[PDB]
Amino acid sequence: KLAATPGMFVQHSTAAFSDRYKGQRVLGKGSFGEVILCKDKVTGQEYAVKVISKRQLLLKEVELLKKLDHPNIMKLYEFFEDKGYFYLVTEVYTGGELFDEIISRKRFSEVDAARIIRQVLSGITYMHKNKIVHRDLKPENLLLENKRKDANIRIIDFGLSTHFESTKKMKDKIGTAYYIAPEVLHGTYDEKCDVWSTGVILYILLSGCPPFNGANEFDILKKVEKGKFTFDLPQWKKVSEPAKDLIRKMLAYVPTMRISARDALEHEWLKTTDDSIDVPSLESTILNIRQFQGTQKLAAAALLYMGSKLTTNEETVELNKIFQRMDKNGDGQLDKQELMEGYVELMKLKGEDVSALDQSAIEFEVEQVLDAVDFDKNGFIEYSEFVTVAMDRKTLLSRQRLERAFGMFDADGSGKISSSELATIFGVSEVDSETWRRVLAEVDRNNDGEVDFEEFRQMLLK
Numbered sequence: 001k002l003a004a005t006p007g008m009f010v011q012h013s014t015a016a017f018s019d020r021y022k023g024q025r026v027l028g029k030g031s032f033g034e035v036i037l038c039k040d041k042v043t044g045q046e047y048a049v050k051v052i053s054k055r056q057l058l059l060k061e062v063e064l065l066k067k068l069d070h071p072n073i074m075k076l077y078e079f080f081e082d083k084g085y086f087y088l089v090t091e092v093y094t095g096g097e098l099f100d101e102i103i104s105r106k107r108f109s110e111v112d113a114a115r116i117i118r119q120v121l122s123g124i125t126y127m128h129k130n131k132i133v134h135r136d137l138k139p140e141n142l143l144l145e146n147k148r149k150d151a152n153i154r155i156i157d158f159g160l161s162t163h164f165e166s167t168k169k170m171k172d173k174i175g176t177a178y179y180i181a182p183e184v185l186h187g188t189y190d191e192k193c194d195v196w197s198t199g200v201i202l203y204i205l206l207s208g209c210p211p212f213n214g215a216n217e218f219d220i221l222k223k224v225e226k227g228k229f230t231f232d233l234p235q236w237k238k239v240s241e242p243a244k245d246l247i248r249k250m251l252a253y254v255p256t257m258r259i260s261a262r263d264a265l266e267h268e269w270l271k272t273t274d275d276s277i278d279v280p281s282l283e284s285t286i287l288n289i290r291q292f293q294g295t296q297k298l299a300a301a302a303l304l305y306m307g308s309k310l311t312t313n314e315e316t317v318e319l320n321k322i323f324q325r326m327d328k329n330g331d332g333q334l335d336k337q338e339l340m341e342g343y344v345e346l347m348k349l350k351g352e353d354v355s356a357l358d359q360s361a362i363e364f365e366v367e368q369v370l371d372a373v374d375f376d377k378n379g380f381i382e383y384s385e386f387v388t389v390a391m392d393r394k395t396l397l398s399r400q401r402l403e404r405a406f407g408m409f410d411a412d413g414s415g416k417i418s419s420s421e422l423a424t425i426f427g428v429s430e431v432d433s434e435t436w437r438r439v440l441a442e443v444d445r446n447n448d449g450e451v452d453f454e455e456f457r458q459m460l461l462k
């Protein structure tokens, strides 16, 4: 098919960054280049851009980020290349670094730490599934989305990340003293390095101190390479055994003996909670998902575009909680069984009896929801797919958002969407005549062979 994915929408622009964005301030420096809070000149929306000098050549971080769609992974909007520069426009997270909260609150609640680590493990479980290793996980590269109390966590800085193969092992030495796994120092490593790092992070969150420390960089790396850490400090008397157990498993010296991300999610400890949802909100969401009816590809791209690239964080904070709670196994994907239990979970909340339920009837209904909603036909409902679908359709199809989507689709400004433009949107040479025929047959009002902003408008407004 034509697989509708958020990533397909980030395309190499041939406009000047300067024509559409305006620098506001410096947020900081990354793995390689600095990040500049910018504003879209026309919509006043804020993004965090990463600028990279051509002199200091690979836009690798862009390709990785297009393949990832996860509620705890940094979002990428678009990117510009210059004579001298690259610009990677991304969503801006306004709660700042975990690092700073660490040095502020000093020590984390087991509840808060479990939540945080769960989301990080979820991000990497997803990444590892897609053959990507981060390689530089630390509180610096974890952002709180906003200032709210128990803010969601985003992974950032994929500038040192790479594709890995189960066949051939990685050799380049990459990371940060406190967080680097011994095998990266040794010169041969795999995706388990990401676990080790996350295990270090966890240790810090719970105790306030790193597990391997030293007077300087060099001292630390020796301590790290020896692998030995202890729970000998007084603040550990306040922490539960399972938490230590997980830590042990995540910092097991030998990679093959160390827990995978995917398995770490299932650990006892990470199910530590205290945090609930309004029934109405959940009901709205569940009802919006049930009522999404599949459609032609122009509409699919449009909705996914609006849902994945044109929605702010403020708008999706509730949707984001729901998804994580419906994702029982953490992997960043909703599956048929997860979906089934969601509806059941809601049914308990409504008093309706679990026993008196046609399990197979529901399971059937769920198969059909999945079919409607799974934009890329990978058998899973990903976050942006979920948002597009679960958001209130009048909220999503605000009169702004509609105008903005159409603009993006009508690349030559002709006031009409052509099949060539649609192909362009999908990142593919041409749209199957079958598909386009299917598309026009449902939309073309004047019947001029193309879709204008009224034809477009009503297409979605159903």
Ligand SMILES: Nc1ncnc2c1c(-c1cnc3[nH]ccc3c1)nn2C1CCCC1
Pocket: 027, 028, 029, 030, 035, 048, 049, 050, 061, 074, 088, 089, 090, 091, 092, 093, 094, 097, 140, 143, 156, 157, 158
């Ligand atoms: N997206 C962001 N939103 C908010 N704050 C951000 C960032 C980034 C950041 C991290 N990785 C990025 N890759 C491409 C752009 C980009 C931006 N870095 N930072 C801050 C500046 C460095 C430390 C925290």
Ligand SMILES: [Ca+2]
Pocket: 327, 328, 329, 330, 331, 332, 333, 334, 335, 338
């Ligand atoms: Ca799942």
Ligand SMILES: [Ca+2]
Pocket: 374, 375, 376, 377, 378, 379, 380, 381, 382, 385
């Ligand atoms: Ca999907």
Ligand SMILES: [Ca+2]
Pocket: 410, 411, 412, 413, 414, 415, 416, 417, 418, 421
């Ligand atoms: Ca056109």
Ligand SMILES: [Ca+2]
Pocket: 444, 445, 446, 447, 448, 449, 450, 451, 452, 455
């Ligand atoms: Ca027309």
